[PDB]
Structures are given as C-alpha cells and as structure tokens.
Amino acid sequence: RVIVSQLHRSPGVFFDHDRGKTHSSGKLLYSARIIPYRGSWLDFEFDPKDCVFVRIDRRRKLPASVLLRALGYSTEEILNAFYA
Amino acid sequence: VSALGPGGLTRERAGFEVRDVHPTHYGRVCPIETPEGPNIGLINSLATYARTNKYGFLESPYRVVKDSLVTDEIVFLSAIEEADHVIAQASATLNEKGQLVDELVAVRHLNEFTVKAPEDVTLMDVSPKQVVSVAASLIPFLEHDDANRALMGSNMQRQAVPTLRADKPLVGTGMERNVARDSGVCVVARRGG
Amino acid sequence: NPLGVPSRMNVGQILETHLGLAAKGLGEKINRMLEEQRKVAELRKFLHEIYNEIGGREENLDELGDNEILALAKNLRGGVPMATPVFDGAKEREIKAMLKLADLPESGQMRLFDGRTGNQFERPTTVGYMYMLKLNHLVDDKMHARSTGSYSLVTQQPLGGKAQFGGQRFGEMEVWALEAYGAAYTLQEMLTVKSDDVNGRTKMYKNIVDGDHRMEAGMPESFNVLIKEIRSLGIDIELET
Amino acid sequence: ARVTVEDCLDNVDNRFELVMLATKRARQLATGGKEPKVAWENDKPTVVALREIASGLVDENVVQQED
Amino acid sequence: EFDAIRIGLASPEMIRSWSFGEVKKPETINYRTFKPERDGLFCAKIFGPVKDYECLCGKYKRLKHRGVICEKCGVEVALAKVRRERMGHIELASPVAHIWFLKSLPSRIGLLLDMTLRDIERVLYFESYVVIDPGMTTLEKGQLLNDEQYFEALEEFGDDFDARMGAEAVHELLNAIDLEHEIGRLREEIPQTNSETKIKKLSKRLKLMEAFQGSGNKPEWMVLTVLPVLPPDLRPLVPLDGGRFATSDLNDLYRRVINRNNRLKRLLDLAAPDIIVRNEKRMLQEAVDALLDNGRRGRAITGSNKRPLKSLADMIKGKQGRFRQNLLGKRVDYSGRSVITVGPTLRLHQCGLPKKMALELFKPFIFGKLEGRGMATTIKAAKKMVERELPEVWDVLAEVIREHPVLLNRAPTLHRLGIQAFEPVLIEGKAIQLHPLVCAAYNADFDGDQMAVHVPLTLEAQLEARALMMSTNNILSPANGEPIIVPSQDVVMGLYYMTREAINAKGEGMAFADLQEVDRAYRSGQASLHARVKVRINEKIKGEDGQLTANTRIVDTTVGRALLFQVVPAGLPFDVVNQSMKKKAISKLINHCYRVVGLKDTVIFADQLMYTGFAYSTISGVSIGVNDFVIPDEKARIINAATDEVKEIESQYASGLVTQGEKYNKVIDLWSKANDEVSKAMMANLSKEKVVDREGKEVDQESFNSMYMMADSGARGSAAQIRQLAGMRGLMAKPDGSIIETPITANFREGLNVLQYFISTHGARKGLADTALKTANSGYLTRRLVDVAQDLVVTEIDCGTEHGLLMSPHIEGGDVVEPLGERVLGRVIARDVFKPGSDEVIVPAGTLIDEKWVDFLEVMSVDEVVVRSPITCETRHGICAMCYGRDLARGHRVNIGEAVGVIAAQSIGEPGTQLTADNVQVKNGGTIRLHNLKHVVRADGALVAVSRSGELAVADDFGRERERYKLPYGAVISVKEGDKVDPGAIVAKWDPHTHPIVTEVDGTVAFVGMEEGITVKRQTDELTGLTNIEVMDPKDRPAAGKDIRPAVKLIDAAGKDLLLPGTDVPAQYFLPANALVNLTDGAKVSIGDVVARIPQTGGLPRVADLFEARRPKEPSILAEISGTISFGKETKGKRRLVITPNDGSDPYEELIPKWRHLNVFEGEQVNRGEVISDGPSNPHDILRLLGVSSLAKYIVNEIQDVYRLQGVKINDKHIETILRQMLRKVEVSESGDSSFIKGDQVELTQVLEENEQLGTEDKFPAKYERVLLGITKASLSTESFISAASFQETTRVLTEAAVTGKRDFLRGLKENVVVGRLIPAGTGLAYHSERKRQRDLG
Amino acid sequence: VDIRNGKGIVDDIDHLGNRRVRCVGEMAENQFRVGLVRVERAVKERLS
RNA sequence: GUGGUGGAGAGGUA
DNA sequence: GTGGTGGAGTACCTCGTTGTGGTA
DNA sequence: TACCACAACGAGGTACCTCTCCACCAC
Ligand SMILES: [Mg+2]
C-alpha cells in the first residue's frame, strides 16, 4: 500500500470578504476563521448592520464584546484600545 | 497529492475553487494530470520538480537572473515568496553568455501573464517540464495537444499493461530513463564493479 | 480513424506518427548498411550525421568503433529512439529534414494500396509508427451474463456482481424509457416475473422449457416487504380487494 | 419476407391492438388450435402471426371465430 | 385480485391482531446452541419454522399435517416462508410518543393539541407538568408548570387539579380531545376573527379534525402503547466464514429497546425512585425514537464504527436515497453486458452477439428445444452437451436465436432511443457488435462503452419489441420529427467526397446512357470519381399520389453523384443528390424520403447509403497530416500589427494618459478584432486553396484539403476548432471569468509555450469540472420532470374544445427566428383559416397539419394561426389525441395509450448535458404597421407615444410582419403607416435616456410650488450646459420644502385651466427630484412636451427556475386593473398609487415600497396587463392577471430561448404538456360546495360544478382561480400518495397519508409499476379498460 | 476592522501557500500522538 | 422429496 | 463466554422551502 | 400587526468494474 500526501488547509487565520446574498445587500466584509492544528475553530462573524459577532465552531452568533470581557479587557479599555 | 480524507474537503463540498487550477499551481502541482470523474481536481499530482518546504508548503526551482546575465544559481521558492519577483519562462533568447537578447519577454509579475523587458526579470524557470506531472511529461509533442486530451492521455498511460516483450517507444521525452530508474522495478548497481 | 483528430484537438498523434515513420526508416537504413557489411567508419560518420543535424549533441569519437558502434548499430537496427522534450521538443522542420534524410516522402504521406482491391487510394495517406498501448480493460473480465441464479434473501432479486453471476439493474431511467414506448407487457414481465417473483420464476421456467411463453403475473415480494416494514412503522396498510 | 409492421400498423392505425391480435394469433399457433392461413416460410409463430395480420387475412372477427 | 391500497394509523388492538407474539427476550439465535430462544427476536413460537414443516423437538417430522401445533413443540408446524409475513409486538412498560408525527415540519400532535412543540418536548422529557382535569381550580388544562410550581399548586388545590408528566400525559390528552366538540369550537371561532394568520391556523385545525373524523382515525393511537416487530427474514443476520456474524441495524435497535423495556418493568415492579424511573422512561423514549427513525434528534451510532445506524426510515427510503432501488430498480435476470464493437456488415434491424452470452442467456430455451427434438432426454444430459458445446447445440442455438428479438440499452438512458430492440446475430468473440447508425441515438462511441443486453420472454414482449422497439421502428426523434438514425462521421465523409466536383478531372464532359454505364466506366478506372459529366437517368416521380411517374432526363452532373443516385429509392427526384451532400443535406434528404416513399424503403435506403458511404470513404485516401493545417501568410503580419498596437497602447497607459480599466477593454477589443481577422483570412485561404488548370488557363476551385472536407462536410469538427488548430487561439478566460489580457498567438500545429498551455489548462479544467455538475443537475431535473408528468397519457380521442393558442412564427429581433410552418408542423388546427380577405375558409377545422398543408400555408400569406394544445383538451384524467399534435416518432397521429408525458419529460430533459437601444432601426424594406399603438399626434405630427404598450411591425409586401419592434414610452415616430420604408431607416426616433414626462395638453403652464431650494433649484451646468431648474429632493429639500412638491398647474396660454380627458383634475403631474424642466414656467408647450426627465441567467439553472416558477428576488411590478394611475405617498415609504378606472373606479391599489425603484409615471393609463415598474417577469401574476395562454406562451418562449441558444431543437408539444401538468390544480374563492380556499384538482372543480348546476342550487356552483404549481410542488400534491412517496419527502407524504387516512386507487403509471401490474398506458390500456369495465359496471 | 475599513485585502484560498501538502510522516505522528494521549490518560488513571 | 450476501472505505470505466 | 452497554472529538456545501419569534 | 432575519429540513446522475475490511468486556 501507499500513503497519498494529503493537501489540506494550513492552520492559521483566514479573512474572507466573499460577496454573498446572505446580507440581501451589496456585499459584506465577511467573517474570519482561525483554524488550529488541533482544537476548536473560533469564528468572528460580521453582522450586516456594521456589527461583529463571535462564535465557537459549534455555537450560535454572539457579540465580540462577550469575548473581549472574558479576555479581561474593560468595556471601555477595550473600546479605547480598538476603536481609537 | 490529494485533498480528500481527514481534515479535507469531501466530494459533497466540491464547489469550484478547490477543483480549479490557479497561477499559484505553476510548477508545483501538475495542472493537467487529474482523474476525470467525480474526483476531478480534488486529487492531483505534483510537478516534476516539486518540493515540500520546511513548513510543508510547496517550493519550486528557479534560476536567479541578473538584469542582463542569467546567474547559474538555483533557488527553490514557495508561492508566497514568488510575489515580488518577476518570473520569466524557461525558454527565451540568450546571447550565448547568459544575456537575454529578447526585447519583450513574457513574464509573470504577481501571477498574471504578460511580456516584460529583460532588464526587469528577476527569476526564470528551470525546465519547461517543471509544470507537468511525471506521466504528463512522458507524452511527446505535448505542446501540440489540447489540455483535455493531455489529461486523458496521462490517465490511460497510467493504466497500461506490460506486454509479453516490451519495446521501447521510438518517440520519447527523455524522462523514461529517469522514471525507470526511480521506480524500483529495475535492478540497480548499489556499488560499481 | 482520421476523423477523430480534428474534433479532439490533439495533433500529437500526427507528429508522433511522422517522427516514428522517420525513426523506423532510419532503423531499416542502418540495418541495410549493417547487412552491407559496411566498415565501422561509414556507420560512425552516418551516425554523426544523424546526431549533428538539429538538437541535443553527439558524443561519438569517444566510443570504440568495433565494439561500441557495432553494439549501438545492432541495438538501433530496430529503429532509432527519438527523444523529444515536452516543450523543448522537435520542431516540424527538424522532422522534415530527418525524413528527407531517411529517404522517406517529405510530406509524411504516401499513396497506399488497398489490400483487397489492389487499387491505390487516390489521395496519399498518413502512415508511420505510433506507440500504441493496451489498457487493463480486457473484455474477458467484462463479459458477464446471467440466465438465473441466486437472489438476495431480503428481496428475491439477482445479486449485482459479475463475480456473483448477477443481473444488471433496470434502473428507474430504464423503466421510464420502457414506458415511453407503449411496451408494457415486457415492462411488467421484467418487473415481476424476470425478477422478484418466487412463484413466477419457477413456473415461467416450466413454461419456457415447455416452449410456452404465458407468464402468469404474480405479485412481487419486494412490495410485500415494503408493506411489512410500513406496517411495522405502525401504519395500517391493506388492499380493498 | 419480413414483418410488415409499418403498413399493417397504418391499417389498424393503432400499433397496439395490432400487438394484441398478434399475440392471440401467435398463441393460437403455439397451441396448435389453428393453421397458418399463410404458408410457412420456416419461422416462429410471432412472425407468421405478423404476416397473417399484415396480409389482412385475419382480424378480430377471424381471431374470435377461430377461438 | 385486489385494488385501492389504503393508509391508516395503527390501533394497538389491530396491532396485536397483526402480532403473532410478544417478544420478551432481546437476545436472538444462540451461537452456542444453534437455535433461536423462546421470546427472542426469532422465536419459532411467534414467527414460524426454521426448516419447512418441522417442529421444535422434531416430534412431527411428517409433512402430512401442515398446520398442526405439537404438544411439546408448541410452535405450529407450517411452511418455512411464513417467517416473512408473521410479525410480533412488544408490550411497552409505558406509552411512547411517535417521532414522525412529532418531528415532521407541522407537529401533528402539537396541531391537535393547539400549542407549540416546545411544550410537548418539555413534557415528553418530564421537564414540566401539565394540568389534567383542572376542574374548579386556579389551574387550567393547557397550563404547564415546574416542580416548585407543582408543589405549590398541589398545596393550594390539593385535588381536582391533576398534574401529569411524560408521554402518558400526552396519551391522556389525546383521548380527552372531544374531536366533535373541538371541531365545532374551531368552526365557530374561524370566522369570528378576520386576522389572516389566526384564521389560517384555525383552518388547519379544522382540516385535521375533519380528516380524523371522516377517516375514523383515533388520535389516541398516535402515541403507541405497543409497537410491531419486523419479521426476522427482512431483518436477517448473516454469519460469515470463520465464525463471524453480521447483524442488521434493526436487530441492534430491537435488542436495545427490548433491553430498556425489561429494565423499566423490573425497576417498576419494585417501585424504583421516581427520578430513576423517569430517567429510564426517557431513555426508552429515545431508544424507540432511534429505532423507528434516526438522525432526527439523537443521531444514534453503532459500536466501534462511525457509520450511523440505519433505522427504519432508511429502509422505507430504499437505496439511492428516495429512489427505491428494490421497488423500481429491481436487477433483472436474463441480462448481460459487454463492450461494443462497430459492425458495418450489420443490417439495421440486426445486431451482433457473442456465442457465450447467447448460450448463457437463452439457456432455458436451449433446454426446451433439446428436450423437444430428442437429443435431450434428461436435463443432466442437456447440461452435459451445453457445457461441452457439441456441434449439435449450435444448430438449436441458432434456431432459437433466429427470430427472437433481443433488447439492448446503454448505461445513461436519456430517452426511449437509449434502449432499443434488435434481432441478434451470432458472432465469435466477447464483444457486442453494434450498428454504426444507431450509435448516435445511444450516444455511444466505441471508446470503451459497455452495452447492457436483455431478452424478452413472452410472445407479448417479443412482439412489443419487434413492433414497437425494433431499431427500424424508431427512426425519427421523439423530441422532434428530425430523423435520428443519421449518417455519422465516416459515412458522411464518404458521401461528401463522392459528391464533389473537380474542375479538370479525367472523363469530364462525356455522357452516359445509364447509371450502370457510369459505374462500369468508373470501376474500370477510366473515369474520375468526380468529373462534370452528362447522363440520362430514369427518375420515378410521385408528384401525384397513386401514380409513380417515371421520366428520363439528360443531366449535367458529376460521376460520384450519379453513382450515389442508384441507391436512392424510386420516389425522389434526382436533383436532391446533385448538390454537395453535406450532413444537413443528408438529414433533410432522409427526412424527405421517409415522408414520401415510406419506412421499409427508407431503412433500405439508409442501409444502402451507409454501405456506399463506408465503401467510398475507404476508397478515398482521406487522411490527416501536418501539412493539412495551413497557416495563412498574413497571420504573421497581423500578429506583428497587433503587437505593435498593443505596445503603443501600453506605452500610452504607462505615460498615464490612458487609464488601466479603459486600456484593458481597448486591448481585449484589439485582440478580438485581430483574432477575427486572422480566422476570416485563414478560412478564406483554406476554402479556396485550390488552383487547377483546365486545358490552358489555370483556375481556382473549392479546396480538397482533407481537414477542409472534415470541416465543411460537417462530418466532424467546427470552425472554432479550425481556429485553434490552424490559427491563433484567441483569448483565454481566467477562473474569475475574466478574459486574460494576453492571448495565445500560437496554434496547435505551431505548438504552445508553457504559459499559454497553462492558461488553456484553466479553460479545459473549467469545462471538465463543470461537466459532472451539469450532468448531475440535468439528471435531477429530468427525474423531477418524469415524476411530475408520468401519469399523463393520451386517453381520449377528441375533446372537441374550440380553444387553442394563437401561435405565430418566432420573429424576435429584426430577423425571422423560426418560420411559422416549422412551428405548426405536426399540429392540428383550432379554428378556421382565412385568406387575407376574410370569409375565405382556407383550412376548415381541426385537420392535422402535414407537409402538404404546411406547403399550402406557405403558398398563402398565412402568418397567425390558433392550434389545439394540451393546455386545451379539457378531458378529465388524460389528454385527447387531437389537442396533442402528430406523434413525433411516427408520421401518423398519436394513438390512445401513448405515454406522452414520459416522452415529453425525456425529450425535455435529454439535452440537459449540452447546456451550461435608443431609436427604432428598421432592418429591411417593408410596409409599416402599428400594433397596440395609442398616442396623439404632436404639433408637427411627430406622434410621440408616451404609452408603454406599443409595438412596430414592418409588414412584408405579402402582408406578413417580417420583423417587429417594441416602441418605448415617449417615442417620436415618422408615421407613414403602410408606406414602404427603405432598409436601415430609423422610422421612430425615440431617445429616452431618462423618464420623460409627456404633456398631451397645450398652453402656458403654471409651475406652482416650484420653490428654488425647497422644491426646485435653478442649477445650471458648466459652459451654459443647461438653462433649467432642478427639483429639490424630498430629503435634500428644506424641512418645510420636504413636504413641498412642485406642481405645474395645467393652464392654457391665456390662463384657461386645462384638465385631462376622463378625469376632471388638470394633468398637473408633480415634478419630483432628478427631473428636468427646461421649458420656462408660463411658456406654452405643444402636445407631447417632455415636462420632466428622470434618468433610469441561462442554462440549466434558468430552465429549472422556470419549471419551478420561483419568484425572483425583485419581480417586475405589474399593473392590476386598467384606468387612471396616481402617485405614490413616499411619506409612509410605500408608494401608494391609487387606480381610478374610467368604466368603474376601483380604488384598491397596493403601495409599492420605495426601496425598489419604480419607473411608473403618475396620472397615466393603468393598462391592467402592463408593467408598473420594470424587473424580471414573474409567472404567477401573469397567470392570475394576464391569463393562461399568455403565461404558456411566455414560459415556452423563455425556455426555447435557452434551448435555441445551444442550437438544440425540441418540439413545443413537450414543454406545453409539462405546462398542462403544472396547472392541474385550481384554487377556490367562493365554493358553496367546498372550503372557501383550497388548492384542488380542476377535475374535482369541474365535476362538482357540473353536479351542482343540475343539482341542489345554481348558487352552489363554485368560483375558483387557476393556480400554478412548480413541478416538485405539483408532483408531491398528486391524488395518489404512492407516487409522491416514491419521489421525495417520503416521511412527510407518508405522514400526510397516515393522518388523512388516504386510499390510493392505482390509476397512475408508477403505482402500477411498483405493484407489478401492467401499465395503464401502452398495451396494458386494453387490460385496464376491461378491468374498469368489469369493476364499475357491477 | 482594518479589512472592513479598507486597510488591507482579504485572503485568497487559491494560493498554494494558503494550502499545504502533508506526508506520511505527518499523519503517522498524528496517529502516534493520539494513541499516546490515550495510553497517557490510562496510565494517569492507573499511576495515581 | 433439498439448494448458498450486509455495510464502509478507496480507486477506475462509460 | 455470556450477559451488558455509556461519552472527548468534531465543526470546512448550496440552494430552496418552510416555519418562527422580533419589530414597525 | 404584516414583513423579516434566522434556523432547520430536504433535495442534490445514471450503470458497471477492481481492492481491503468489518463491537468490546471479562470473572
Ligand atoms: Mg464512450
């Protein structure tokens, strides 16, 4: 027998802005995916109404503020670091 | 090199992106050697000079060229590192001293195909066969056959049957010696004597 | 068939055929000077003429005449093996020059003679030597055939393998094609008595060996299997008689 | 000759009832209960039945009466 | 016999009636003791005997008593097969909920209990209680509560408030439903509320209650107390060599559920803790769920294998998903297969056959014959001779083969020609010899195709094959009358080569007395095959029917054509072969001969023609060499010019004067033009590449380059392929669909660079990848089509309806796309046909249009006709034979019993694989005529037409419209109606570029409310580009100016108020934003003045979208009722333009949200059928507003556009038949005899209306609206549930049948298929007719 | 947020750089690691 | 008076 | 050999309906 | 209160050929 070399996606971060009719509008700078070599994949969705949603691989859309607060950044410190 | 299997796309997630050739496949994955049928493009074959990187990506050989002279040094390069360099086709006019004499030479700056000036080229390929597969390299006059028929020709070449008394093809691509040696079916002198 | 060339745009057949004709001509030629008991010098100079023509490079005069050249000619007597790279390969004019060197017709085409009528074909045809392969698709393992045999225990239907002496499946598209014709008796036959009728297959065997073709209809057991499983799904199923 | 399945199909203008009567005639042949009013040319009951109907010498009345 | 298969729910009583036992032991057969266990999954007490006619202890080994039950051996002695019918039950410790009725999209139990499935899911898992018998307490029946609330409620109430939890609570709810009382309450409540959603829910409740009451079904049976067990044979476990056993999934599921039930009973009898007992109840509920279905909730898995367990629903689905392999596929005996091989020595009706396949297939026939003639006395001897193959067996084998037709089919059968009958011929080999002409029908090349064989056994089947499926019978395509047994590549090459002319050839100019003389001269070799010669010939002409007129005529022809004519039958003029005989010419000649001479002679001609084509192609030394591809000398110069130009353009871009985007388009245009020039030059070079000398001066003639005949003859190849072969290959396209800015200058003879090959690889891989997905999509589409139209069969002979379709030649564009005669061929008329002068009956009535009649119509100036269609033919349950046109595979009219629906579906779906403006400019010189034109002449007579509906037709001198043009709103036209306009004239000078606001009134207007900044703005462009005032936007205006709208009050020049005709208000249309009022306020404007100016896929997906009639994302907004239109109120955000019809003002006019742009002009004629705002065209609103025939025409044109784009030809009969299948259902508005709103079969409506007319009251007759259904939707809504069950949604449709208690009378094709009965259509029509006769009549 | 705001460009999975080819060693090591963690948890349960 | 194949995976042909 | 049976590793289509809880 | 985003179900081509490989535990 022989083992055929598998060509697969390299683990890491990937940013997608593929236009889709999901927004029913022009386009969306779509989500980004971080893929681990082993573990869960975190997804950072971008809501059509200029909002950022974050979910685990098998979890529903949740706002990124939850993840920011869980990371320990303050609701204002995180904003001051990111938005400004 | 296949794309199915664990951690890989199934045949129900085919789409088109995985099943299509991109300029980044140049010299790394054979663009024409792949089985026609349900698994097309999903399961491909490496180029003749293909090479995995330390990081597992694909690297391809090229000769560094000075603005005039073609330096004999040879470098293996991955797709991401090919962006800056302007790559010239392996066949081009030469001044018998390494100087590209053509005025407008076909090149690829950032994976788009156009002509350029010899003063602008930075890398140029090793051999024209560095794009096709091993089976794809074995069809003579391949430059005169369309891509579909090349694919089928490779595929049936993969399914030949050894005859009672094999006879060497009168027309060959020179690669037959290489593949014959590389396959273990031939007894090879481990030590000279 | 030449007509397969222009549609499937692969000219490599024609160029390969021409070059192979040239190669075989050269092989026969060197065979004749070898049979003419030519001295080694003639063979060496002719070979150099071959290898100085267009591309690659000769390496002779580094080979001992009587040993190396004679062995090479003996091996080459069956035809000179050409080596053409995928894209750095032989140009058309190179093949043409070799052909005229091979004393063969320049255009690579000659008028042939019919092998039965003896009449020469009016137009010259392309002939030559082409590397032909035989694939692992021989009919000996493809010819399956079934009259009757074992059937699946669940549904009394022929097994599906040539290995299992199985019968082909008359897929749903086949039955559509059948009903597109007005042919319904054959459809009912192949649906019921040719397959999935325990009490029909035996009796039509009796009829056939008796020479009668009557084919009592019967009732497929696959449908009653569906009935049984639907009933096991807690769904009442019955016929109004 | 051969089966005149085209001209006879136009006479009845059905090409289905033709098959029906043909089946009954061939069964009459196989059962031996009747004679081929067409002279046999060494062939099986189906084709002789097709010739019988094609020549117009047998029809629904003829089949029923011969029954 | 039997009939009328039923569906019902399982009553535990009748379940036990079914059951032969109560399985209590989860374990099955003992491996150690080779026996099943009492109360096991295979217990003989329940299911029957292992070996036939035996008892457990073997006490009764005798076969005499086949029904007795022994004393020690309790299990009754009986036949062994009874293990397949006998079933058993399981007695459950608790009632458990059925999953299907719960997890189907409408939760049946939730619908019956009138609350959401969340609540029952809660209760099913013992999460919340529910009140039973609330009595006189604060609790209520629907109330559900938690543990703390439960304890509090028990404390406060104590009794008269029973709280329950679990599936048993649901069961107690079900039998306490008061179906009559609930139905009465729902009926009372339904009209009380006018809200749409609530009335919809109440309607569904009433439907369910009525179905239950009429069906006699008890809802309490929904939650089963006991469940049946599958008979052991259908769930067998098989052992393998080495002591391995392989058990079915159903056995594992049964073991699991029995285990859990035993757990429940034994923990229950000792009164286990309540938490533990409810937990076990829950796992038993989950286990029975997983048994009866899988993947819906839990997705149960097997042990040490990732493959999910295959539950019962997976069995009922069958293999291949829902397309039941066991039920419809059904592998067939007396079958075989092998690779094909071309047999050119084969007559059309015959095919080759390997000896071994023949002797294997016909083995019972061999046995019968051998026993008959006497060389076989025992069958062992017969087997002995057949295995040794004595020379004797070949004689009998040939005899049985002699007149036995054999049945052949390829793997992908896309139409009835994909499977054909042949008369086999024995050959020595292992391959199947095939007739070369039939390969086109099979679409089977000899590149390795395998061909499946079958043999018909009954005389019925053999006659069906010989008379209906013989290759000779089917010559013309069922899709279109064009022949399908047509000369292919090589024979076409031979024929074309024979029929050429050489300017100077041996023997030209000398004459022949007869064709035989020509053959004698040519075979002697003293005459060239193609030289201009004279020959007198004997042509038999059938110009008048009944007399075959023979005449002799001396003709100047070539030798080859004269030789060919000897093959042609005696019913055609010789002139039909005097031309070059290309492939299309050959097809036309074959079609002509078939319709003239007949069929037997037609096939004789076909075989002879093949023989001649093959022979003289063999004689011809036609061959391909590298010299054949000719590269024009000008190609190098053209390429150099293109390179120089593109280098100059690149330099210009680099200088910055040229932008990148414009440069890309410029260079691709340059390259395309250069490629076209190269292709044209090389084609001209090749075609005329022949210089010959004819007795002195050299001359030129048609080329004889081999590849040139390959192209021109049409045998093989195409101009595009020549372009790639001997010419520069043009632009290749990137994967994004963008054309690469650098082309491939080289051809294939020249060879390609690695880069150019790389790009060609992009293209080729694109095509190859798309191929498989296209095939899959086409397969799905054709399966849906055949399933939605399987039942439709020609049943009646003449409906007699006088409705048809006004059907005209395809004129789209400036040129005639499709001639009228070709469209009407094979159809039948629906009314009189008249001369241009009326009252002159040309074609009287429904007479079938034939070749004579189409030529007659061409003789006259017929342009528009109305033809009977299956959209007509109101006959119930079928289709009359007139409204469906002539049969396509037959020159004759269709016959009753022809499954046109299946034929139509196959024809439409077969070619799926092959798929993927200012002014009016007249084309030619013709008389100008106006259609649907409504406009008043301008002051100068410009006659600007602001009306939307209007078209311009350029009638020919005969009178027919050779072209038609659509006139846009606001089009100024040089109106000379009837005057011949020279070709290329621009008669109408429309130039919208904007939405102009016409002014049919005259005088000095008063632009009231035109505030400069609040409503208008005198903003002028640079260089005095305009002296105008631009209206202010409703948002960009001031806060008060936002509500201010400009209004040009219609005043005359002196001050007289002007008002629009019909309605008293002035034509003072508001001047919205982005308008252009260049006319000065108070300036008298002539009639038709532009007051305000407001500036404004294909392939299988398109046809699938049409066949589903899916609503586009933004459909074109269409008018409702004709009349006076109004303006929309943007304040609400939805433009409410009220309609004021003049005959009667109906204010009902919906408001279109401004999110979509509306191009409608306020205060105009509504034109009910017309479009208010542009966009893609929706189908349903055309059906409900424009009518039926209009919708059918639009759909047919839309589909045929896609099909004609690829050049594939299909008769409109098939698409129209599909359309008839779509519209089989109607919706009712006011019934008086049925529900208010119901999608019901139009047959039901017709029957009910006819009965009610001569019935109770004349007012009981119902008013209903026709409704359009997509094929997938329509097929699932068939009267017969079985067909939908075998199609898709098997769970859903089965649940509908169960809850509705449906009864299916097998009156469709697929039903008689699955049951194994004869087809209602075809030859089984007589059998079905007699069955109906004997059943209905006593 | 930069990509959404126009700073930078989206990634393209077409680039063979974004993909990677494994080799028998990689999946062999992965299977060995999986078996190793199973044996390790077994030992930790036992060697406690 | 008696007659012997599930599922998964992979590849290939048309 | 003959009773007896529960979760850390996996998530990577593509429409097209259909039903549902949210907001104007 | 009628649209509407969102989630779940349900479909996604025929036929044929070749190979290997098949629940654990556990006194
Ligand atoms: Mg083929």
Numbering used by the authors:
A (entry chain C): 147 to 230
B (entry chain C): 535 to 727
C (entry chain C): 1116 to 1356
D (entry chain E): 2 to 68
E (entry chain D): 16 to 931, 947 to 1126, 1135 to 1376
F (entry chain C): 438 to 485
Reproduce text from the manuscript describing this model.
AlpA positively regulates a programmed cell death pathway linked to the virulence of Pseudomonas aeruginosa by recognizing an AlpA binding element within the promoter, then binding RNA polymerase directly and allowing it to bypass an intrinsic terminator positioned downstream. AlpA then positively regulates the cell lysis genes alpBCDE by functioning as a processive antiterminator. In particular, AlpA recognizes a putative AlpA binding element (ABE) located between the −10 and −35 elements of the alpB promoter (PalpB), binds RNAP directly, and allows it to bypass an intrinsic termination site (tB) positioned downstream of PalpB.
To prepare an AlpA-loaded complex, we performed in vitro transcription with a DNA template comprising promoter PalpB, followed by a 68-bp C-less cassette containing a consensus −10-like sequence, followed by a CC-halt site, using Pae RNAP-σ70 holoenzyme, AlpA, and GreB, in the presence of an NTP subset lacking CTP. The structure of the AlpA-loaded complex was determined at a nominal resolution of 3.7 Å. Extensive 3D classification did not reveal a complex with both AlpA and σ70, indicating that σ70 is released upon the formation of a loaded complex. The structure of the AlpA-loaded complex reveals AlpA interacting with the RNA exit channel and having the RNA 5′ end threaded into and through its ring. The conformation and interactions of AlpA in the loaded complex are similar to those in the loading complex. Notable changes include a rotation of the AlpA C-terminal segment as a rigid body associated with the loss of AlpA-DNA interactions in the loaded complex, and a disorder-to-order transition in L1 associated with the gain of AlpA-RNA interactions in the loaded complex. Clear, traceable density is present for the 14 nucleotides (nt) at the 3′ end of the RNA product: 2 nt of RNA are located upstream of the AlpA ring, outside the RNA exit channel; 3 nt of RNA are located downstream of the AlpA ring, in the RNA exit channel; and 9 nt of RNA are base paired with the template strand DNA as an RNA–DNA hybrid. The inner diameter of the nozzle is <14 Å (the shortest distance between Cαs), which is too small to accommodate an RNA hairpin (diameter > 20 Å). Therefore, we infer that AlpA renders RNAP resistant to intrinsic termination by prohibition RNA hairpin formation in the RNA exit channel.
